[PDB]
Design a protein around this ligand. Structure first.
Ligand SMILES: *[C@@H]1O[C@H](CO)[C@@H](O[C@@H]2O[C@H](CO)[C@@H](O[C@@H]3O[C@H](CO)[C@@H](O)[C@H](O[C@H]4O[C@H](CO)[C@@H](O)[C@H](O)[C@@H]4O)[C@@H]3O)[C@H](O)[C@H]2NC(C)=O)[C@H](O)[C@H]1NC(C)=O
Ligand SMILES: *[C@@H]1O[C@H](CO)[C@@H](O[C@@H]2O[C@H](CO)[C@@H](O[C@@H]3O[C@H](CO)[C@@H](O)[C@H](O[C@H]4O[C@H](CO)[C@@H](O)[C@H](O)[C@@H]4O)[C@@H]3O)[C@H](O)[C@H]2NC(C)=O)[C@H](O)[C@H]1NC(C)=O
Ligand SMILES: *[C@@H]1O[C@H](CO)[C@@H](O[C@@H]2O[C@H](CO)[C@@H](O[C@@H]3O[C@H](CO)[C@@H](O)[C@H](O)[C@@H]3O)[C@H](O)[C@H]2NC(C)=O)[C@H](O)[C@H]1NC(C)=O
Ligand SMILES: *[C@@H]1O[C@H](CO)[C@@H](O[C@@H]2O[C@H](CO)[C@@H](O[C@@H]3O[C@H](CO)[C@@H](O)[C@H](O)[C@@H]3O)[C@H](O)[C@H]2NC(C)=O)[C@H](O)[C@H]1NC(C)=O
Ligand SMILES: [O]C(=O)[C][C][C]([N]C(=O)[N][C]([C][C][C][C][N]C(=O)C1234B567B89%10B%11%12%13B85%14B%1158B%12%11%15B%139%12B%1061B%12%112C5%153B%14874)C([O])=O)C([O])=O
Ligand SMILES: [O]C(=O)[C][C][C]([N]C(=O)[N][C]([C][C][C][C][N]C(=O)C1234B567B89%10B%11%12%13B85%14B%1158B%12%11%15B%139%12B%1061B%12%112C5%153B%14874)C([O])=O)C([O])=O
Ligand SMILES: *[C@@H]1O[C@H](CO)[C@@H](O[C@@H]2O[C@H](CO)[C@@H](O)[C@H](O)[C@H]2NC(C)=O)[C@H](O)[C@H]1NC(C)=O
Ligand SMILES: *[C@@H]1O[C@H](CO)[C@@H](O[C@@H]2O[C@H](CO)[C@@H](O)[C@H](O)[C@H]2NC(C)=O)[C@H](O)[C@H]1NC(C)=O
Ligand SMILES: *[C@@H]1O[C@H](CO)[C@@H](O[C@@H]2O[C@H](CO)[C@@H](O)[C@H](O)[C@H]2NC(C)=O)[C@H](O)[C@H]1NC(C)=O
Ligand SMILES: *[C@@H]1O[C@H](CO)[C@@H](O[C@@H]2O[C@H](CO)[C@@H](O)[C@H](O)[C@H]2NC(C)=O)[C@H](O)[C@H]1NC(C)=O
Ligand SMILES: *[C@@H]1O[C@H](CO)[C@@H](O)[C@H](O)[C@H]1NC(C)=O
Ligand SMILES: *[C@@H]1O[C@H](CO)[C@@H](O)[C@H](O)[C@H]1NC(C)=O
Ligand SMILES: *[C@@H]1O[C@H](CO)[C@@H](O)[C@H](O)[C@H]1NC(C)=O
Ligand SMILES: *[C@@H]1O[C@H](CO)[C@@H](O)[C@H](O)[C@H]1NC(C)=O
Ligand SMILES: *[C@@H]1O[C@H](CO)[C@@H](O)[C@H](O)[C@H]1NC(C)=O
Ligand SMILES: *[C@@H]1O[C@H](CO)[C@@H](O)[C@H](O)[C@H]1NC(C)=O
Ligand SMILES: [Ca+2]
Ligand SMILES: [Ca+2]
Ligand SMILES: [Cl-]
Ligand SMILES: [Cl-]
Ligand SMILES: [Zn+2]
Ligand SMILES: [Zn+2]
Ligand SMILES: [Zn+2]
Ligand SMILES: [Zn+2]
Lengths: 692, 692
């Protein structure tokens, strides 16, 4: 038979291993010749594997690169203007790769150029609350200072935005061993920890879903009209540069001014973590000088788009997408994901060659320029938005397959919770101690749900990956899954976006038997298989009703911190609770009808109701000042692009409301956002009502 | 059999006549008890007639009414402040209706209150070009003047916007006999002409598709958050009032200052049509004083929504809608349309009672508050936008069925041209001299197409009626049809929006045998029947390809008035012509496939391609500063809401471009609009490509 089991059995750990090795021998930086060559290889192989059609879709987007003959670096300068200490110009390359060329040195993509010089202020993680503590409590003024901030907790782009709004004239980002060095493990190459010379690359844009900074709304195709740089979306106004903890120690050790306000501000280096501004007595005349010469350049990028045409509903698209561009070798990010996708395509293609086709069309994507702001996925979705709007069933992301070796991690729409439960109960756990047990059992044991005993944690989608345009802009049901660490016993993974992320890191330290990679291929691939093959779409609307009530309870409790204002301004959540109650009731009736209907019009009518349910949460007017975040239930947090926020319009209207100078106007806007959310929930519910 | 012929034969002229008489005995002003009573009567009757469900949908929207105990009027005042002449407080009521109560006196709905006093300037029709001629050529300054303008040529709301931008402190609108008195016909009640005491009512908003001024984006339901009046959409800033030509003569006769610039500025009254400012020598010390005391009030309105559930595709909606609210008796506007809708519902219901059902669902609507800004249709569509987006096949409007007795008038999407041709060839002409001939033959004879011999004129949709939200906001294929006058041998119809629009006007002067009403019922009803019953949707994509080329040629020729700027700024239309060529090619291939496919998935897949083709022209970002006009091919003219403009984004970027102070920036924006139009055309074309 050709069924899910056949698909799943054809997947092989040894193949994922071969593909990972193949994808990680040279850097594949977006916009470079090497990454175009890999795109062409993937296109050829997907054709060989049996897909009906495989095309490149290219765009010309703004990218950013250091100047090869004018390197970026930071100095401490004395009062004579002698640079007495300079940060490193490159990470020491890993063993056996010391002769690879075109390793891009560490830099912050899209930094403007400049050579600002000034006194340092240390701002902890540069979070909104860290700046509140500095300015409101400690009375420290960042205006015209250079801020130094440790990586971790929140997206680096939010750190830069926060520093910029505080009046900083530059930002230095560094990796503290408190966040990137796990106790009892050695530094690369002898373990999976970040060495003192290691540096995390990464873009520092605040795109809010726009895609290419120059063409918001429309694909960056051959005839595109582009904004001028001054009107570009999301570019920072002050220079930024990342360093490792050897260099950070040299910048931090002379810090004077105020002591850190509490221990949550101290990392693991042998320095006091003084906030400043400036250096102690003896060195008070020395300053810090940045030298940034990176340039922004419009550059061609290439997505690979593979099609496996559906046998019955070819006009319904189930999409499996992940990126191909990497900062350097991409051993985990993204090639651990791309190797999994490659094996999934191979397995589907094996079935196709035997005469099988999925019920619905499956689209496979190898996105470019994800590291520069989700540019390749976003431009392609802007190009194809009408097809995606009306035909998109689901999007499953496929970036890094592992960030640890402990248990599964899933973030997805509630419409996929039941699908994920049912699938993981049919898969074998790869974990030691759980041989012969299901993945559901091991995952539920290691990562229990905080709400329900006997069920695993599944999180909201945030952002910082290629599902953003599909989910928060277009309203297509979306999900992602990877293996992860025990969060209960450091930040992401230590070698994230460093030159040390290699094939050897994965094969030696994370997944020597490629069993976690194989399990992740079974989860991502099994989800795509069910979405594209199941007669009735595998979405349960009742799961959305349950989370909508949780989110309503949560946003109500935030508001009820201000009981006197809610009385004065007549702030009522009754409309929202009413809408959520109605959604619960209507979803329950729709589910009965879905169980209780040979009629392919009723089926497809009801499949269309299921498909367009995520779509009903989109507001074509967008959220305030964020027109490409249109989903009313979920947006990336205004304070941390990686984290999801529920009822974001209401959340942001309530945030720090007690500081607003005109409370009537601020509470008016809370009420406006309650109305918009209640209306959108009721409107979504009514899409599940009988159609006539 | 139950086929179109059965439907069409059941329609009766005598029924339309009975319903018109029934709907026009008392005023049905929006927001009044009488109009709520008529809504309840229509709901009961549509149930009786056999519809599956008939509901009221109510909203609380901003309306406007004169103050009963403080009437609006205009004076000429002498230097002592004596009001030496006052305009009338009411139109003389027509014979037999002199005791009807609650006839609203003439007023301009949504005028602010004020008692401005000043010198008059006469501005012809107050069009953009009339203000250009005044200010640029004649050097006449309107700042702080009261402007007097004749009705006609363009929507009155555009006149008020133009006067306001010129700095006027008030606007007087009047009906000139040149535009509202046809030679050789007598005044009501002895003919169909406007008497000297007759006055055209009407709103003066500039909503640009927003709906209720207080709730743009969202339905004005029970928990709606409303803007304050100061932030309301579309309200005028200066007082406005309409008068008849007896009163206008008294205001115009003393006018001095400059002579009219040419004969196109002179109407038919015995006055010189001097532009002013102010009065001649003897009277130069007299002024004009307005007294406006109308109030804006949030008021409940009621739509009637009738459903005839489809047998095969109940989740596909074909909508027949027209309004019910009137200024006074509504003899033509809207009840000549509503009586036609009522008979259409009756006929469909007769078939239903015999066991018939349409293939697709038909929705019937009696909209409220159309006269106050398309409020009832727009609020209901904001409420139901997700259902309409994903399920709306077509919208057929049904306002006034007659504005003359000469020939047919159709404005619609090109997707309906072939449908309208085929239908009118099967209908009998009602015209004298064409007995035994088709409606197509008589219409083609009297109103020949300007492009193709042997075909009738069909116009673009403009606006100023209830299709606006469905077509230009939501992108649902839309059409309208009525009987009209010979435009070749006055403005609209003379008694438009006056107390003299009565049952007797229609029965005595326009359509004594109700044969034009019956033909219009056959056209509107036949279109709804084919849209809701035809196995393949009756849309021909190739007709869009033909008009897109015409519109591209037209917008290119406008730009080519500025050859030197197109060279300097590298302004190319090549991308747009390329997109139109591609649309032509792809539409031709789709048509072949549509002819050449027993498979209901392929059918419904291709019906979905047909349904979503109009939808593909919507840009979710809207046009500049007009977020509710989203259709890229068609918007209401920025200078005249009634007229349609093609490629409106490019048209407005080119308009008066030679006057812009920064030509680089102005031509940049032309290029941006070319890119947006070319992209949207190509994206629409690609929705017709093979789906996988
Ligand atoms: C969740 O679902 C329920 C449906 O089960 C839905 O109930 C609806 O609530 C609306 C809004 O409250 C009701 O609106 C009323 O409708 C009647 C006519 O049917 C009007 O007379 C009412 O207005 C009068 O009373 C008001 C309230 O005091 C006054 O402000 C007003 O001035 C009038 O005097 C009122 O508009 C509607 O009838 C029900 N529909 C039902 C019960 O079927 C509820 O709205 C849904 N929740 C959300 C968030 O949509
Ligand atoms: C109408 O339909 C046709 C398809 O039949 C479509 O043609 C496409 O045009 C685009 C845009 O011109 C072509 O883009 C090219 O693609 C190749 C790779 O296939 C690139 O190498 C080309 O770029 C080079 O040359 C450029 C132009 O001089 C340089 O600016 C650039 O720097 C590169 O050197 C170029 O991007 C595309 O191949 C075709 N597709 C075909 C023929 O199948 C046309 O775009 C459609 N019209 C619209 C408005 O969409
Ligand atoms: C995840 O798996 C569960 C458990 O298998 C699925 O729920 C089950 O789905 C079936 C199919 O609809 C239900 O069967 C129905 O039972 C009723 C009798 O009560 C009958 O009328 C129907 O004709 C049909 O046989 C079954 O009750 C249900 N079990 C539950 C809800 O506990 C679930 O659908 C899966 N989720 C997916 C696929 O997203
Ligand atoms: C308006 O009426 C015209 C004329 O009747 C309709 O066009 C006709 O449509 C039919 C049905 O698709 C075409 O018939 C086809 O002919 C080909 C052979 O060439 C055959 O392969 C198909 O199986 C089918 O029999 C016919 O050619 C066509 N005539 C034309 C285009 O001149 C038109 O569709 C109607 N418009 C509507 C309904 O919107
Ligand atoms: O532009 C854009 O938008 C983005 C791009 C890029 N892209 C990536 O890279 N991407 C990745 C990472 C993220 C993640 C990590 N990170 C984490 O995981 C986390 B976040 B939250 B908290 B925060 B901390 B705890 B929680 B989560 B956890 C930790 B962090 C993944 O997706 O894979 C970046 O970012 O740079
Ligand atoms: O608010 C809005 O938006 C609207 C509302 C209301 N609504 C109506 O009333 N509506 C009607 C009328 C119009 C038409 C008449 N008008 C005409 O027809 C015309 B327009 B254009 B030119 B101008 B002149 B030649 B052409 B067309 B013809 C003449 B006028 C119809 O639709 O029926 C008004 O307007 O007030
Ligand atoms: C990764 O694998 C691919 C596929 O085998 C290798 O590309 C092939 O290289 C051989 C020998 O040089 C050629 O004959 C083929 O034309 C290539 N096939 C393609 C590009 O589809 C590629 O060289 C491998 N990369 C590494 C680093 O091992
Ligand atoms: C830090 O780097 C700078 C720049 O390369 C070094 O300063 C330069 O030193 C050379 C040779 O001594 C001079 O000719 C240049 O004029 C200097 N440039 C600048 C910008 O000062 C500096 O010596 C380095 N510092 C350390 C400690 O290595
Ligand atoms: C218009 O027609 C309707 C429908 O016949 C009339 O309404 C009916 O009036 C009779 C007698 O007063 C009542 O018994 C019915 O209950 C009414 N039916 C309804 C409202 O559905 C209405 O009076 C007529 N109006 C005019 C001016 O003739
Ligand atoms: C125009 O109307 C005004 C207002 O009704 C008339 O002026 C009023 O006349 C009465 C009685 O003579 C006075 O007591 C009021 O003080 C006047 N009001 C104002 C605002 O002036 C005026 O007579 C009318 N003019 C004509 C020619 O009829
Ligand atoms: C890189 O280095 C210097 C900076 O002035 C210059 O010679 C060259 O133009 C630069 N390259 C750029 C800016 O791309
Ligand atoms: C901090 O920085 C400078 C001091 O020169 C000043 O202009 C700015 O207003 C200060 N802000 C606060 C909040 O103290
Ligand atoms: C792999 O799993 C082992 C066993 O728990 C653990 O000690 C080790 O830290 C893991 N490696 C990584 C990179 O997480
Ligand atoms: C109508 O007339 C006067 C205007 O001041 C006043 O007595 C009454 O309040 C007015 N009605 C309104 C404003 O609705
Ligand atoms: C016209 O009106 C007043 C004259 O007081 C003046 O303020 C305004 O600027 C004038 N405008 C033009 C264009 O002449
Ligand atoms: C009705 O038609 C006759 C015959 O052409 C014409 O003379 C008359 O003007 C028409 N009536 C109206 C209101 O157009
Ligand atoms: Ca773009
Ligand atoms: Ca509204
Ligand atoms: Cl992922
Ligand atoms: Cl109409
Ligand atoms: Zn990645
Ligand atoms: Zn990354
Ligand atoms: Zn009307
Ligand atoms: Zn009207």
């Amino acid at each position: 038979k050709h069924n899910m089991k056949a698909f799943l059995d054809e997947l092989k750990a040894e193949n994922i291993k071969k593909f990972l090795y193949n994808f990680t021998q040279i850097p594949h930086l977006a916009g470079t010749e090497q990454n175009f060559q890999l795109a062409k290889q993937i296109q050829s192989q997907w054709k060989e594997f049996g897909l009906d059609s495989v095309e490149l879709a290219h765009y010309d987007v703004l990218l950013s690169y250091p100047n090869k003959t004018h390197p970026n670096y930071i100095s401490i300068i004395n009062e004579d203007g002698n640079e007495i200490f300079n940060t490193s110009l490159f990470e020491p390359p890993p063993p056996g790769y010391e002769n690879v060329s075109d390793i891009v040195p560490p830099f912050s993509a899209f930094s403007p150029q400049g050579m600002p010089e000034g006194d340092l202020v240390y701002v902890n993680y540069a979070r909104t609350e860290d700046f509140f503590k500095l300015e409101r409590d400690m009375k420290i003024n960042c205006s015209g200072k250079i801020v130094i901030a440790r990586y971790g907790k929140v997206f680096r782009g939010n750190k830069v935005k926060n520093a910029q709004l505080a009046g900083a004239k530059g930002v230095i980002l560094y990796s503290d061993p408190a966040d990137y060095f796990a106790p009892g493990v050695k530094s690369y190459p002898d373990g999976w920890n970040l060495p003192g010379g290691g540096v995390q690359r990464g873009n520092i844009l605040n795109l809010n879903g726009a895609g290419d900074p120059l063409t918001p709304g429309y694909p960056a195709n051959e005839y595109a009209y582009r904004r001028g740089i001054a009107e570009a979306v999301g570019l920072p106004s002050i220079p930024v540069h990342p360093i490792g903890y050897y260099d950070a120690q040299k910048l931090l050790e002379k810090m004077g001014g105020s002591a850190p306000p509490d221990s949550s501000w101290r990392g693991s280096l042998k320095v006091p973590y003084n906030v400043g501004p400036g250096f102690t007595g003896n060195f008070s005349t020395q300053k810090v000088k940045m030298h940034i010469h990176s340039t922004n350049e419009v550059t061609r990028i290439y997505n690979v788009i593979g099609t496996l045409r559906g046998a019955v509903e070819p006009d319904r698209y189930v999409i499996l997408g992940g990126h191909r561009d990497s900062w350097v070798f991409g051993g985990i990010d993204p090639q651990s994901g791309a190797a999994v996708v490659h094996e999934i395509v191979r397995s589907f293609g094996t079935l196709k060659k035997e005469g099988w086709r999925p019920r619905r069309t499956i689209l496979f994507a190898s996105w470019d320029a994800e590291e520069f702001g989700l540019l390749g996925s976003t431009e392609w979705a802007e190009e194809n938005s009408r097809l995606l709007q009306e035909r998109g069933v689901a999007y499953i992301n496929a970036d890094s397959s592992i960030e640890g070796n402990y248990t599964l991690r899933v973030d997805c729409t509630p419409l996929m919770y039941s699908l994920v439960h049912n699938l993981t109960k049919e898969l074998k756990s790869p974990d030691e101690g759980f041989e012969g047990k299901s993945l559901y059992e091991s995952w539920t044991k290691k990562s229990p749900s905080p709400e329900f005993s006997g069920m695993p944690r599944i999180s909201k989608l945030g952002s910082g990956n290629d599902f953003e345009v599909f989910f928060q802009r277009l309203g297509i049901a979306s999900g992602r899954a990877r293996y992860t660490k025990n969060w209960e016993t450091f930040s992401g993974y230590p070698l994230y976006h460093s030159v040390y992320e290699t094939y050897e890191l994965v094969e030696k330290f994370y997944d020597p038997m490629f069993k976690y990679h194989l399990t992740v291929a079974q989860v991502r691939g099994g989800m795509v298989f069910e979405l594209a093959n199941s007669i009735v779409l595998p979405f349960d609307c009742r799961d959305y009703a349950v989370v909508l009530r949780k989110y309503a309870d949560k946003i109500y409790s935030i508001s009820m911190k201000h009981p006197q204002e809610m009385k004065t301004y007549s702030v009522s959540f009754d409309s929202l609770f009413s809408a959520v109650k109605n959604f619960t009731e209507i979803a329950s009736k729709f589910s009965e009808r879905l169980q209780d209907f040979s009629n392919p019009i009723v089926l497809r009518m009801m499949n269309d109701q299921l498909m367009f349910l995520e779509r009903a949460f989109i507001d074509p007017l967008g959220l305030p000042d964020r027109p490409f975040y249109r989903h009313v239930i979920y947006a990336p947090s205004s304070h941390n692009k990686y984290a999801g926020e529920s009822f974001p319009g209401i959340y942001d209207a309530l945030f720090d409301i007690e500081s607003k100078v005109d409370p009537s106007k601020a509470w008016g806007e809370v009420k406006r956002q309650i109305y918009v959310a209640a209306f959108t929930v009721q409107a979504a519910a009514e899409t599940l009502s009988e159609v006539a």
